[PDB]
């Protein structure tokens, strides 16, 4: 798009012939694409020839622009002749008897937030950090570390994108990024590294109750695709993929001291984030879709997790 550093070279500028409404007539047309959506065509001398990532697996639908992915809460309800029981007995371990129980015909409002490596906007544990796993003796089992207090995350795409519409055949419009207004700069997320560090102390202390006297070591995800190795969102309608390697770092001993002094400090840990538009949703090839771009710039204030360790 303007050569230079991977902050700008994240965007290719690509052109193609496209079919107008008039079946015999093709028009030359152009768009910007994020590098992961694009793959180099073979059978050429390492040239400027490319294709979309999905043409050799499945034709993805563009998501209709009226459709909104926002996590509006769902209540589940029991049919007639059934009842939903729930625990009032909080700080529950996830199996065995609850001492304080209620019926409800409908659940509280649950948000269908889909993500990885963290949850977001989840309801908090009642009085303390709670650690749940189906069998801690087996490393195959996840450890759901349910938090007591909301650490805040701020995420943004600070490029000022313009949307353009490409007319394809009769009565259809593909949508693509036409231009970036003014400055480049990088998509990223910010967490107050003070509150995060305290939270990794407090998870240290509770996780040590199941692993007594041991020092606790956090680390980055081991490896794989972006979908495995990055945290993920849909802020506004963009499928961010953020590298968490600097976040799950350091090792913390049984001392678990309040190293964050009571005085003011402004240390923010920052995550740099890729973006994609063609997504093979929920590891499905036929589930795949193209998200249309969103004009302007994005900000996305949020409360974090019960960690998926």
């Amino acid at each position: 798009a303007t050569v230079k550093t991977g902050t700008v070279e994240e965007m290719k500028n690509c052109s193609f012939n496209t079919t107008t409404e008039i079946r015999d007539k093709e028009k030359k047309e152009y768009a910007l694409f994020y590098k992961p959506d694009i793959v180099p065509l073979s059978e050429t001398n390492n040239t400027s020839e490319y294709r979309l990532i999905n043409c050799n697996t499945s034709a993805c639908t563009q998501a209709c622009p009226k459709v909104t992915f926002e996590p509006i809460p769902i209540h589940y309800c029991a049919p007639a002749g059934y009842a939903i029981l729930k625990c009032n007995d909080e700080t529950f371990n996830g199996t065995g008897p609850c001492s304080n129980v209620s019926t409800v015909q409908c659940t509280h409002g649950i948000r269908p937030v889909v993500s990885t490596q963290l949850l977001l906007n989840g309801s908090l544990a009642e009085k303390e950090i709670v650690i749940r796993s189906e069998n801690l003796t087996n490393n195959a089992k996840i450890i759901i570390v349910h938090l007591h207090t909301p650490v805040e995350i701020v995420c943004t795409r600070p490029n000022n994108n313009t949307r353009k519409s490409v007319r394809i055949g009769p009565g259809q419009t593909f949508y693509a990024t036409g231009d970036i207004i003014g400055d480049i700069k990088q998509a990223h997320c910010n967490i107050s590294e003070e509150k995060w560090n305290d939270t990794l102390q407090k998870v240290g202390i509770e996780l040590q109750k199941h692993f007594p006297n041991k020092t606790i070591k956090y680390n980055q995800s081991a490896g794989g695709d972006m979908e495995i190795t990055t945290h993920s969102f849909n802020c506004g309608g963009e499928f961010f993929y953020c590298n968490t390697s600097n976040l799950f770092n350091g090792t913390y001993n049984g001392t678990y001291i309040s190293t964050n002094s009571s005085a003011n400090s402004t240390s923010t840990i920052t995550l740099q984030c890729r973006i994609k538009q063609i997504i093979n949703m929920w590891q499905g090839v036929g589930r795949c879709m193209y998200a249309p771009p969103i004009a302007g710039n994005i900000t996305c204030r949020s409360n974090i997790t019960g960690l998926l360790l």
Partner: antibody
Amino acid sequence: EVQLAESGGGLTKPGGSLRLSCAASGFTFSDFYMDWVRQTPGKGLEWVSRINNDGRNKWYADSVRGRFTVSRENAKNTLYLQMDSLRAEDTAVYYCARDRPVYRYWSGGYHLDPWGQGVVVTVSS
Amino acid sequence: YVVMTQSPLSLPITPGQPASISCRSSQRLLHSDGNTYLAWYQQRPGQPPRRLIYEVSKLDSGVPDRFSGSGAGTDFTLKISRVEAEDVGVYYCGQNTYLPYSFGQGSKVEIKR
């Protein structure tokens, strides 16, 4: 540090062409807008042109629009102004000055700070 | 467009005395981003301009503390708590809020004798 060095100054006939080179030292030259500003005994100060950090967007004053073009080579820490169709009034002292920063995550307000020591251009042969 | 204008031309003023200069734009210097982008430049005899006061009123790095400033909307001032021999030369206001960036016609500080 942050030091700017203008160079390339000379004499020409009216209607002719000259090129000015500003070389940048002790700052990250990829990360600034850059401006040309010029001085005469009549006017005091006049803005000439602005260029984006990646070289993409460019702006000029009404007095030189289309006649001059501005350019940069971030591989050299270097800015160039190409001047063509030089009028008698373009006879001035030309300065290079550093404008708006564009860091990784954010990009603040407009400036002309610091300034190089300038170069001389004469348009009457 | 933004026209600029400074009120005092010559300042024939004794070393040690306060002085001030006022500059008054044709249109308000407030930018959409919510800062106001005036600055004040000193040119000594035989030198390029350098910037003393900027973002209305902040001192730029290395500037002597005797310089200071104020203002709002279109109207802004540079104040010197005590003028000195090294203050001699021409002062310009300038705006950067709108293209073209534009400059006052100047004011000259001079030793009184």
